[model samples]
Target: IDPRAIPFANEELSLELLNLVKHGASLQAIKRGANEALKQVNRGKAELVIIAADADPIEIVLHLPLACEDKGVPYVFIGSKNALGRACNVSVPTIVASIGKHDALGNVVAEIVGKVEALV
Candidate 1:
């Protein structure tokens, strides 16, 4: 699959997987701090969580991976915070994002999701 076709051009396919959540596809985007990502997992609001590979407060978002693992959710690190923010259409840098179940835009989301997933 062409990596550029995925949601976030700079991140690996795993990180772009969170984009599926944006369009009511097979996922949900949970924009929260590290604590919130952990909270979402505990509350069953996430099936997967993506963390910024270059997070300055790495310790802050670090716990999310462990929490996700404990909760049986998949977690991955994307290369850049800027690309993730762009994919979510946000200007602020985000450290973590959670993805859940499929939504209405399943087909389109899946196509993009698949492009990224193939890389992983």
Candidate 2:
């Protein structure tokens, strides 16, 4: 486990986020690498950033949290890369998945955003 990882980035939120991904509730990018995720971050449309915990080398996707910080967005690290892939409805592992800004969620996304901000 990454000692630097945020506390509640563990079990609870992972499942909720996973379900959200599966349901496609928001403008989500089931991004597989760092580049697209950063693009989403830089696009200023990203509301929440989810990174996989078991990322190989870890550094490959670490910039996301920092970028989210600089961009004033919230971020959370999920437990399994493959779990995210499954959540994304894919067969391969996913490194990053960004949920873009939207007006559709009413109170749902806002609460998710709230929980993620608790990480910092």
Candidate 3:
């Protein structure tokens, strides 16, 4: 695991996060990859940020946590890139992803946000 992958999601939380990402993808509210996620976060459009703990070069995604902090956004790291990619409905693995706020998922989003906040 990456040393900087702090606030990492355990099994239970990872499952919840993956479910959220799965739902977000169906609604087209998810942005995959570091660039896309960072863009969403920097623009204040992100509801949640999820990073993969197994990213090959952790530096590629090291900036996201700080960016999320600056934006007051919720973020968590999952242990597996493959599972995260599956949640985003993507064929390849993703290092980071952002979920845009949507009322349809407001309840769960808020719940996850609260959970993430408690971790930090």
The 10 consecutive residues of candidate 2 with the worst lDDT sum are 23-32
The residue ranges of model 2 lying beyond 4 angstroms of the native Cα positions read 25-30
Clash number for model 2? 0
**Which of candidates 2 and 3 reaches a greater lDDT?**
3
Q: Candidate 1 or 2, higher lDDT?
A: 2
lDDT of 1 by residue, 35-107 (tens): 7778889988775666776777566776775676687666666766676666556687777776655555446
> Clashing pairs in model 2?
none
For 18-90, candidate 3 gives per-residue lDDT tens digits of 9999999999999898889889998999989999989888888888989999989889988998999989898
- The residue-by-residue lDDT of candidate 2 on 21-51, one tens digit each, is 7655334534546778798888897766778
What value of lDDT does candidate 3 attain over all alpha carbons? 0.89
User: Candidate order by TM-score, highest to lowest?
Assistant: 3, 2, 1
Against the reference, the lDDT scores of all candidates come to 0.59, 0.74, 0.89
Stretches of candidate 1 exceeding 4 Å from the true structure: 1-15, 21-29, 105-120
lDDT of 1: 0.59
Error at 111, model 1, angstroms: 9.7
TM-score of each predicted structure versus truth = 0.67, 0.85, 0.96
